[model samples]
Target: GGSPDENIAKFEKAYKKAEELNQGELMGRALYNIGLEKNKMGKVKEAIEYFLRAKKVFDAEHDTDGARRAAKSLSEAYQKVEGSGDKGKIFQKEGESILE
Candidate 1:
């Protein structure tokens, strides 16, 4: 509900808490939210890293919806990092293939 930086810190703290509790779903969601905040801050590479972690956890937990959401976000982050519109499409297609 505050600035992107504040949200990022909040999500990171939540991520640590989830990690300590061994809560996979919460950890995944926190990572995804942190990735979103990073993307909003124009830190696309860092966003991609968080999204990748979230996607991995979601896939292992069989959370298809969460995995897809993370992958979509990752694709957008990759596009931003690459500075190419088609890069997002490529990343998305690859993500779909891997998910399936």
Candidate 2:
């Protein structure tokens, strides 16, 4: 395996690549990845949108696993979004709903 930069720049490149390929799976991955970095960097506000969009991309592709993965982080990001805890709960519930 090669080295990974583990930075937003790398994810940005991946996002563009996925965008051009028009692949929902890869596109959602890049979005979810960027959301992680943004959350860790104290940009939870920005990450929320990415995660939300990521889940939609997964839903668009009918990818249940990807939807759950995005929701996991999405809920976390929302909980830390300037006291938007309830929003996170709502999304977290959606994840539960996916089980049925």
Candidate 3:
């Protein structure tokens, strides 16, 4: 395996290049890698920021698989850093629409 520093540097370069290219899918993948890098660095908050970025990108692109993976990361990250706000009673009934 390569050195952690080496891998992180590579990932950062790739991520930045992907962003410069304006490739949403590629950028999302890079963000995912960034989250992994942050996690390895033990910067949980930073990791979550990347994860959230990836999630938003995935959702915006309507990539269900990517969105699901990002959602899982978000749930875990939220749980690890701070408890998700408790569920609250709905003031009014609402209908939901499926993206697919």
Off by over 4 Å in 1: 84-100
Q: After superposition, how far is residue 43 of candidate 2 from its true place, in Å?
A: 0.8
Model 1 residue 54 lDDT score: 93
Highest-scoring model, TM-score: 1
Q: Which regions of candidate 2 deviate over 4 angstroms?
A: 1-6, 82-100
> Whole-model Cα lDDT per candidate?
0.82, 0.78, 0.71
Which digits, one per residue and each the tens of the lDDT, describe model 1 over residues 68-97? 999989888876767744433342332233
Clashes of 3: 0
TM-score to native of every candidate shown: 0.75, 0.71, 0.66
Candidate 3, 9-70: lDDT as tens digits: 78779888988997777778778766766655556688788888987888888887887876
Name the lDDT value of residue 8 in candidate 2: 65
Error of 1 at 72 (Å): 0.3
Model 2 TM: 0.71
lDDT tens digits by residue: candidate 2, 3-90: 2236767887989999899999999988887787777666888888888889999999999998998898877886677475443334
- What's the best-to-worst order under TM-score? 1, 2, 3
